[PDB]
């Protein structure tokens, strides 16, 4: 199917406590593969997936070097933003950055991203054409002017369509057994009596990959959206994911309900019924 590579960067200022915390992580699809933590002793980019561990010292020296340059940039940005918004020196603030690429089933480039957020809200974002910038306020517009004059979009576009895609493909190849696998959900249903007039019917999806899934309840064929308890898709901790949907069913209506499951690993969508 389709694939993506993402790097996520979080920079948090710590007033009167020295240098800001800086955390970097990289994902291929829903699999983390690298990290960097400024508060760690190593001070190096580190493997977080088995298939990247034996990439040579040249790889790790290079990623370590570049991520440190990322760190130094963010540290300055915190100050610059502190000024753009006339904020105090005693307040803690968060800068976030995300960039990466999407490819299709044919591993060909679909989309590129590069965007920043200041204290949890959009600040500046590269548009889909990878040629223009979205800035909301005056501060962001100022940054946008800097970046137009330094032709930032052009260099970013090169990476996004080039090395980003190029190296996403390599990771997919190297980690084939894991990154190119499709674990169809293991599904089951539980039934528990909340009282003597009602029972909880819960539909489970377990040990599936990737994370994207559709989990729905129907009563005699009609959607039960607002009457369905639906949890966020969650990691099992072993590289697979879980999710469940539940409905309160009145006495003797179990046969009316159907649980519906859609996932990359299932040829045809599953229909489950308590019976």
């Amino acid at each position: 199917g389709s694939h993506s590579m993402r790097y996520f960067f979080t920079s948090v200022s710590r007033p009167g406590r020295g240098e800001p915390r800086f955390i970097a992580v990289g994902y291929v699809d829903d699999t983390q593969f690298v990290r960097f933590d400024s508060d760690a002793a190593s001070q190096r980019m580190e493997p977080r997936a088995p298939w990247i561990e034996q990439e040579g010292p040249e790889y790790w020296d290079g990623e370590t070097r570049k991520v440190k340059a990322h760190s130094q940039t963010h540290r300055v940005d915190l100050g610059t933003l502190r000024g753009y918004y006339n904020q105090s020196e005693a307040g803690s603030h968060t800068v976030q950055r995300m960039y990466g690429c999407d490819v299709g089933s044919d591993w060909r480039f679909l989309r590129g991203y590069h965007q920043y957020a200041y204290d949890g809200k959009d600040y500046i974002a590269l548009k889909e054409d990878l040629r223009s910038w979205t800035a909301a306020d005056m501060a962001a517009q100022t940054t946008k002017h800097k970046w137009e004059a330094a032709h930032v979009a052009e260099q970013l576009r090169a990476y996004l369509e080039g090395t980003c895609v190029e190296w996403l493909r390599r990771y997919l190849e190297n980690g084939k057994e894991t990154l190119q696998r499709t674990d169809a959900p293991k599904t089951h249903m539980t039934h528990h009596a909340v009282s003597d007039h009602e029972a909880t019917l819960r539909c489970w999806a377990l040990s599936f990959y990737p994370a994207e899934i559709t989990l729905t309840w129907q009563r005699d064929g009609e959607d039960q959206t607002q009457d369905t308890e639906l949890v966020e898709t969650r990691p099992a901790g072993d590289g697979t994911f879980q999710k469940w949907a539940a409905v309160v069913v009145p006495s003797g209506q179990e046969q009316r309900y159907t649980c519906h499951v859609q996932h990359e690993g299932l040829p045809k969508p599953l229909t489950l019924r308590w019976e």
Binding site: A69, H70, D77, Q155
Partner: peptide, 10 residues
């Protein structure tokens, strides 16, 4: 692989 930046500031 990480982007190789000049770098660029906000």
């Amino acid at each position: 692989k990480l982007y190789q930046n000049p770098t660029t500031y906000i």
